[PDB]
Design an enzyme around this catalytic site. Structure first.
Site, PDB file in Angstrom:
ATOM      1  NE  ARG A 168      -1.810   0.768   3.916  1.00 33.16           N
ATOM      2  CZ  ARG A 168      -1.283   1.666   4.744  1.00 33.16           C
ATOM      3  NH1 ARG A 168      -1.445   2.957   4.512  1.00 33.16           N
ATOM      4  NH2 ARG A 168      -0.587   1.276   5.805  1.00 33.16           N
ATOM      5  NE  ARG A 172      -5.287  -5.354   8.917  1.00 38.25           N
ATOM      6  CZ  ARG A 172      -4.539  -4.576   8.149  1.00 38.25           C
ATOM      7  NH1 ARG A 172      -4.000  -5.076   7.044  1.00 38.25           N
ATOM      8  NH2 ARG A 172      -4.312  -3.310   8.499  1.00 38.25           N
ATOM      9  CB  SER A 173      -1.233  -6.320   8.363  1.00 41.47           C
ATOM     10  OG  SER A 173      -0.168  -5.817   7.582  1.00 41.47           O
ATOM     11  NE  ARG A 208     -16.501 -25.360  23.154  1.00 39.68           N
ATOM     12  CZ  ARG A 208     -16.958 -26.605  23.274  1.00 39.68           C
ATOM     13  NH1 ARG A 208     -16.126 -27.593  23.594  1.00 39.68           N
ATOM     14  NH2 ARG A 208     -18.245 -26.869  23.072  1.00 39.68           N
ATOM     15  CG  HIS A 217       9.996   4.539  24.907  1.00 41.87           C
ATOM     16  ND1 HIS A 217       9.165   5.569  24.519  1.00 41.87           N
ATOM     17  CD2 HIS A 217      10.632   4.967  26.023  1.00 41.87           C
ATOM     18  CE1 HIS A 217       9.291   6.576  25.365  1.00 41.87           C
ATOM     19  NE2 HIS A 217      10.176   6.236  26.287  1.00 41.87           N
ATOM     20  CG  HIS A 220       4.795  -6.967   6.033  1.00 41.96           C
ATOM     21  ND1 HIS A 220       3.499  -7.246   6.415  1.00 41.96           N
ATOM     22  CD2 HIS A 220       5.005  -5.663   6.335  1.00 41.96           C
ATOM     23  CE1 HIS A 220       2.953  -6.157   6.927  1.00 41.96           C
ATOM     24  NE2 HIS A 220       3.845  -5.184   6.890  1.00 41.96           N
ATOM     25  CG  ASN A 273       1.620  -5.182  17.635  1.00 39.06           C
ATOM     26  OD1 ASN A 273       1.797  -5.315  16.427  1.00 39.06           O
ATOM     27  ND2 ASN A 273       1.147  -4.067  18.169  1.00 39.06           N
ATOM     28  CD  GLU A 309      -0.704   1.302  21.092  1.00 37.77           C
ATOM     29  OE1 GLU A 309      -0.167   0.223  21.442  1.00 37.77           O
ATOM     30  OE2 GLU A 309      -0.747   1.719  19.915  1.00 37.77           O
ATOM     31  CG  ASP A 315       6.755  -3.054  10.365  1.00 37.88           C
ATOM     32  OD1 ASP A 315       7.815  -3.680  10.585  1.00 37.88           O
ATOM     33  OD2 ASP A 315       6.716  -1.873   9.956  1.00 37.88           O
ATOM     34  CB  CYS A 355      -2.134  -4.232  12.725  1.00 42.85           C
ATOM     35  SG  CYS A 355      -1.850  -2.774  11.677  1.00 42.85           S
ATOM     36  CE1 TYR A 394       5.867  -1.538   4.433  1.00 39.86           C
ATOM     37  CE2 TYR A 394       5.963  -2.185   6.755  1.00 39.86           C
ATOM     38  CZ  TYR A 394       5.234  -1.789   5.643  1.00 39.86           C
ATOM     39  OH  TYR A 394       3.874  -1.647   5.725  1.00 39.86           O
ATOM     40  CD1 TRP A 411      -1.196   5.259  18.700  1.00 36.93           C
ATOM     41  CD2 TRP A 411      -2.099   5.112  16.654  1.00 36.93           C
ATOM     42  NE1 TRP A 411      -1.573   3.954  18.507  1.00 36.93           N
ATOM     43  CE2 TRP A 411      -2.132   3.834  17.259  1.00 36.93           C
ATOM     44  CE3 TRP A 411      -2.613   5.266  15.359  1.00 36.93           C
ATOM     45  CZ2 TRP A 411      -2.663   2.714  16.614  1.00 36.93           C
ATOM     46  CZ3 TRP A 411      -3.143   4.153  14.716  1.00 36.93           C
ATOM     47  CH2 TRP A 411      -3.165   2.893  15.346  1.00 36.93           C
ATOM     48  CE1 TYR A 424      -5.825  -2.500  16.550  1.00 39.62           C
ATOM     49  CE2 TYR A 424      -4.918  -0.268  16.436  1.00 39.62           C
ATOM     50  CZ  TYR A 424      -4.933  -1.583  15.992  1.00 39.62           C
ATOM     51  OH  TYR A 424      -4.044  -1.968  15.008  1.00 39.62           O
TER      52      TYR A 424
END
Ligand SMILES: *[C@H]1[C@@H]([N+](=O)[O-])C(=O)NC(=O)N1[C@H]1C[C@H](O)[C@@H](COP(=O)(O)O)O1
Ligand SMILES: O=c1[nH]c(=O)n([C@H]2C[C@H](O)[C@@H](COP(=O)(O)O)O2)cc1[N+](=O)[O-]
Lengths: 264, 264
Positions: free
Chosen positions: B21, B166-167, B126, B51, B207, B177, B58, B169, B146, B209, B80, B94
């Site tokens: 993108r 789903r995505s 469940r 950090h 991925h 995360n 967050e 970095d 993400c 970059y 952000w 979120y």
């Protein structure tokens, strides 16, 4: 399949004794992933005979955005009979969310259509997702989605797909779910002129019901056979125009089926 | 961390060249899963200095149901800034979905609270799920989630959690995360008087970059150090009453940080 049987054995060796909603009891593990290269063949179990008729019609049913079992009855599929009410309604389950996710501002979002459009116009997108987990309507569903979230991925002209299944009945539901999504990937790949890639299955609460022990041990002692092949006799105008006759499975020689009680 | 570095190496070895993108270009694989036994220690990368102030603020921000960066500014967190509009708003991202998922019939569902209720009254369920993937509002978000879907699990008095990202970095976002959710599990576990279990991480488009390659190999040449320890100085009335001061990290001796350009 090799991956399937190893998972089944894993639940027996590492599974923990849990008391479930049905009161039947289960052996479960949390978190597991298996990959299926669809180039090697259609992932339909061979250590157990599976009714391909029920799998194909339920998927075509989903794609229609239907949540009434009337259609499954006309085709002799009684897999959703227990949860439907007097009218044959299940609430806004799978199909409803796939084809018409209701937004708060009165609109409706067709996730399948957007996904086809994303695959054709923006295949590199990392947001090619379809979700059945609509928090605002879980209360109106006859049952919360087991296979709740999936994502498509394109690389080197190959279409891949990963499914997140929050709850999984290893013996009864898993082999049904794998074939179902594998089939979708093929339909998607055909409509977008792409080659089939991998089908990644990720599970949450992966379990084996306590009254499936004997059947499990029985299936575990069988030697898996070569994977079948999926043949699609024609290419419809859209992904909503497929029919039961369009699918043909070749080289499927499974062991005799195993009977087992369903936990409701 | 061992798992983190192996993943990193795997993207380099098996990753395929993809256009994204941002037009930056990436090396990516699809589908991956790794587990972290939180008993062994707090999963905070050592081959790179992280950090902790940003990670905690967050998360507290998310738990408030806030989507405006004002709060983050008051505490010197600028992670952000690039996506916020003139007013500091990011749209229903979120925190909004977590604390107030809007239903079509005018109601709002607090997913965090219901999860707490489920862990205390029905831990064997469940369906202990929190989803940020609200299809109906993705168009109003400054950026699509993400880390979009997570599920809790309880067994032997231990609280586990699996996240579906789903995505990802790998270089810039993943270590952030992992620490964020691991911290949530500890907070959940402390409120429900449970022990910490495993944190399972599952990724979609994982991925690296293209302009992160040198930094990646630099980090990859480092020897991971022993995992630090998380100490919570008190037990608030509710999970919404935590403060930055309640958290203490010990034995954290990381390698020097590695600067790298953020892809917007
Ligand atoms: C997105 C992210 N976030 O806060 O928005 C996070 O927490 N972790 C990530 O790694 N993450 C990355 C994945 C990807 O490289 C971009 C988002 O872009 P799209 O996938 O194109 O939407 O940020
Ligand atoms: O396709 C499926 N896959 C599947 O394995 N499940 C199973 C998982 C579990 O044993 C049960 C649903 O129960 P619960 O997780 O308590 O909502 O049914 C149920 C569905 N399903 O209903 O569509």
């Amino acid at each position: 399949m090799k991956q399937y049987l190893e998972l089944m054995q894993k639940v027996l060796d590492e599974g923990t004794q849990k008391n479930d909603r049905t009161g039947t009891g289960t052996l479960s593990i949390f978190g597991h992933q298996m990959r299926f290269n669809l180039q090697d063949g259609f992932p339909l179990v061979t250590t157990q005979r599976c009714h391909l008729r029920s799998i194909i019609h339920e998927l075509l049913w989903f794609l229609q955005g239907d949540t009434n079992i009337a259609y499954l009855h006309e085709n002799n599929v009684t897999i959703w009979d227990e949860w439907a009410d007097e009218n044959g309604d299940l609430g806004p389950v799978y199909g409803k969310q796939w084809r018409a996710w209701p937004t708060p501002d009165g609109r409706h979002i067709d996730q399948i259509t957007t996904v086809l459009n994303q695959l054709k116009n923006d295949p590199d997108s990392r947001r090619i997702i379809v979700s059945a987990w609509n928090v605002g309507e879980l209360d109106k569903m006859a049952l919360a989605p087991c296979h709740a979230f999936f994502q498509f991925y394109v690389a080197d002209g190959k279409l891949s797909c990963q499914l997140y299944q929050r709850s999984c009945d290893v013996f009864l539901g898993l082999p049904f779910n794998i074939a179902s999504y594998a089939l979708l990937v093929h339909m998607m790949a055909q409509q977008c002129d792409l080659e089939v890639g991998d089908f990644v299955w990720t599970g949450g609460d992966t379990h084996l019901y306590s009254n499936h022990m004997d059947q499990t041990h029985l299936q575990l002692s069988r030697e898996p056979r070569p994977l079948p092949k999926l043949i699609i006799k024609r290419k419809p105008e859209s992904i909503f125009d497929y029919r039961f006759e369009d699918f043909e499975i070749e080289g499927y020689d499974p062991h005799p089926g195993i009977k087992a009680p369903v936990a409701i």
